[PDB]
Design a binder for this molecule. Sequence first.
Ligand SMILES: *[C@@H]1O[C@H](CO)[C@@H](O)[C@H](O)[C@H]1NC(C)=O
Ligand SMILES: *[C@@H]1O[C@H](CO)[C@@H](O)[C@H](O)[C@H]1NC(C)=O
Lengths: 29, 40
Amino acid sequence: ITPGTNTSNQVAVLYQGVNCTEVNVFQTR
Amino acid sequence: KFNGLTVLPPLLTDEMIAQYTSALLAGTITSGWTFGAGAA
Ligand SMILES: *[C@@H]1O[C@H](CO)[C@@H](O)[C@H](O)[C@H]1NC(C)=O
Ligand SMILES: *[C@@H]1O[C@H](CO)[C@@H](O)[C@H](O)[C@H]1NC(C)=O
């Protein structure tokens, strides 16, 4: 998932609390 | 789980929902109908 143009690029990878170790970086609920 | 099914979280957590029902209660108990129509 991504945000817009001035709000430039920066993406979410949509896990059910499963870790970011599969992929600044911020683990999220 | 192998099947591509997912369950996304709600935007407001149960903690945030309980803070809204708390604000609705505290407005109702201290200020009557007034907080529905203006300042409390
Ligand atoms: C950036 O923000 C301005 C605000 O006026 C908007 O017009 C514009 O469409 C936005 N995006 C880009 C690519 O400039
Ligand atoms: C995965 O994330 C949880 C918190 O969401 C953490 O307790 C756990 O140690 C992490 N495991 C690994 C292998 O990164």
